[PDB]
Amino acid sequence: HADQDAYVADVDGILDVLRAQVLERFQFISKSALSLQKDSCDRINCKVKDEQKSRALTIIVFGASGDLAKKKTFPALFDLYCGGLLPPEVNIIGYARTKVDDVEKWKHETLMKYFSNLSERGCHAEDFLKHISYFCGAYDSVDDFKRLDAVIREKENAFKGPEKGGNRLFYLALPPSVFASVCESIHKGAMPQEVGGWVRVIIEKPFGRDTKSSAELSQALEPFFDESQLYRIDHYLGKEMVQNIITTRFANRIFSAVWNASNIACVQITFKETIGTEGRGGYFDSIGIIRDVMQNHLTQILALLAMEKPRSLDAECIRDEKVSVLKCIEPITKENCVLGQYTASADGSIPGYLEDVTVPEGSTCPTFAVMRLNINNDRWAGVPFILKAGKAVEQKYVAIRIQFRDEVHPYGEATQRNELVIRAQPSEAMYVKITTKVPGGDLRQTHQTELDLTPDAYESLINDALLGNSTNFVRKDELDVAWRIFTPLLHQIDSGEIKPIPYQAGTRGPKEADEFIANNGFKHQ
């Protein structure tokens, strides 16, 4: 309805007129309201901001000798350095349990092995290692964090610059079981100095495995770090796609006006991988495809896509809207879910999921899921939202597909449903499919045409955290709502009330899934 969007715009335009009147200094808002009634391996070029330059900065990577830290975090930090997005005087500390004598060989052997050895980057590796130190320490001794504090205080007091104190980003590349321990230890032991500096904490998934376990972690952490400080990171959600979702829609009347039940026939969000899970049963078997990427990754995409209009692009305004729309979503039913589990590829190259020492025999863990979500609000009531995720399928692909309702009249078969695709993998692309004339010479001689409207994902998130921008991080309330959307389903699945269909590695998945989709409003182009 034009009136749904008009009313919001009228409220915002009233709050806007109470803005430029209150620009002349609660009780004044009440009075004004009734009143309105009556009417090449080159040099790193530093792209960092002034404030970023102005105070010291230490990044502490905890669990620095783990696979995530050494293969993912440190390389990501390296790429940001090469991109000129770390402050000049950035200090990095790898905190970990094991004692190390030859500090410099550890950086070279545990860390540099994994750096991007590309042309434009390789030459900067040694430069980056200068900014790194090692810290031997455990994740609970108050002593160890007192010592670390003093190690940081020395580097911060050495900073050659205008502001005192130090900004501190604690990056917990650890198993969630130690999050609370470390967090309290930081709180008691190693917060930024009184004089100045912010404190930020990046934590890694899993964020529980259901409503109850997730809220226990939130409760454990919330004594020590609030939602301005805590950053729950989703490696796979990048700047590029988020901007495509938000900007393309909210900046433009044309897309804004059609982004609703009256115009949209159906929406799919798809996350497909050719890779399987081989030798990862130790993580995956207990998690399943749904907890792994759908409850966390796909649902945040969905929230950004479905949300109502925030009043501004301030992060918490957007996060507020993510929560509101998630709260409109009905808990997913077992009647709206098709599950799969992959067997060996027909060509015998790829082994099945159960064919794995790190997977328990008999496992019914799903590697594939397609489900329908109902968003019960004025904007979305009736519209099918399809989430689809799967391992060992036919191609690597992440995209949003919005199919618009057909204009049957008057072009009939000389036209076709409009679409909007926002694709992130294997490469970024955003387009609309529309119908246009061909130059020749009758009106029903039409064409299908694709208007193109167009640091990696993980890196862009670490950068956002340094910048203090939490837009693309799940907030504590948001996380809780998301868990309530999926947990009843996850229970039904673990109680065996629905079961995975087998599919061979390299196919599309269970044929049943494609029938589900087609039976839930999608029409083939």
Place this chain on the structure above:
Amino acid sequence: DAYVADVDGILDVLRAQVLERKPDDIFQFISKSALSLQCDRINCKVKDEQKSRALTIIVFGASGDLAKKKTFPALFDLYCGGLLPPEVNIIGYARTKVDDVEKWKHETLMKYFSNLSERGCHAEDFLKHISYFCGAYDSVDDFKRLDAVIREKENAFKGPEKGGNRLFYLALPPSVFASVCESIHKGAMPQEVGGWVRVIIEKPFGRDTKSSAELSQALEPFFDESQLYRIDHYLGKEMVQNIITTRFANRIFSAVWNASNIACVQITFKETIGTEGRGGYFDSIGIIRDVMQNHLTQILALLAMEKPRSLDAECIRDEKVSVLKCIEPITKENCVLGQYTASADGSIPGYLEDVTVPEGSTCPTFAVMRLNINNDRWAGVPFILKAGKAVEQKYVAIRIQFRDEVHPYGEATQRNELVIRAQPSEAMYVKITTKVPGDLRQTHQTELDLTRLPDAYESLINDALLGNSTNFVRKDELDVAWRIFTPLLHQIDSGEIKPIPYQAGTRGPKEADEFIANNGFKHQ
């Protein structure tokens, strides 16, 4: 410098309110959300007789959770509001020796005082009125020693009259009530020269007809029903006036307050909190004894009574008794029980997860039941009491649903309602159908609103201090109240009904809502 723009921040709150609620008139809603988005010498408001004589308040069990977290903070609030006499003496009476009474004051009491500015700045002054007294609850000599301590404060009283008034507050297990009352009777009654004696006692008042009557007979040699105040913490003055005045002062409400016009009456008490690890204690009590036989029944009496001969306390109490005597004993077939299980987010563990709860507990944390008031006014009208822990909102209200006018409006009208709500905020309103301007069949449901003071608990203590016993259950009233519930409780304890599990934070068991719909209620 000061580019705070927290303006924008509050604009955001307004926005969220407007779009949540979606008013027709944005402007007028902006005002009402803004105004409702918003130190000094104490002004003595106390009356003539109250300033005339010494007052001493003795809180027995002063280091207990009830006394330090509820009673003493309430007295502080009364003090800050000018509702205690200026020379009031407060005595905390307990059994543990205390080296430093000043530290006790600061650590045991002042910790639970309201941190409100306009109160904080009075705490130290209030503490000057509090003494600690250490003694037993059964030794006459301790009460004589207490009497000496009181007489000393009374005799230094600088106002006109002699002796003093004594309010004894028994924040104790009822097992010690008789021994305290006897000890008071022998040892520290007010001075003969002048002063009254009042005694406030806490629930439970027994746990069935027999235990309760035995308790009343243990106390009546010492205190009569003008001296004895059985306190129900939850019964506020504001609710009671809503119940009494709206009806009895008005022809329109009096005329419809009967079987000819009312389809059903529901009295609801809902909390989001569980038993909070005190399940072991709750388990011997259960929801029916906890709030229904006492609290909801008093609300029912006030709501259902005949017109009092006057608005005097004992005339109201006489009518409370008369109506309760009309009520049939509740049958098990008119009762649905629940027991909560863990909340979705686990913040409320299941009732049975508490290790202090014994395996196999069928204690109800939830109950809905129907009472039949067999009199001319009420014959055939279902009265529903509903109470529940660990449900979906904190809420206390009376809902009166009137009979429908089938003709002529049919589906273009629905049943009128009178709501008197106390929690989470006071409201009272009627829902009637009215025309929309713009088609006789085009109608709207509208709510007519009929409209820091003391809170409900503070109101009752203030009432005891003033001698107003309206909102206190009288001995005879209590007996009758117990005769309504005791058969049912017996059936429950014999295992004849069993509680339906419900998840903490839901409404309760689906069978309870169906029971309500089966006994005369119709959803909007």
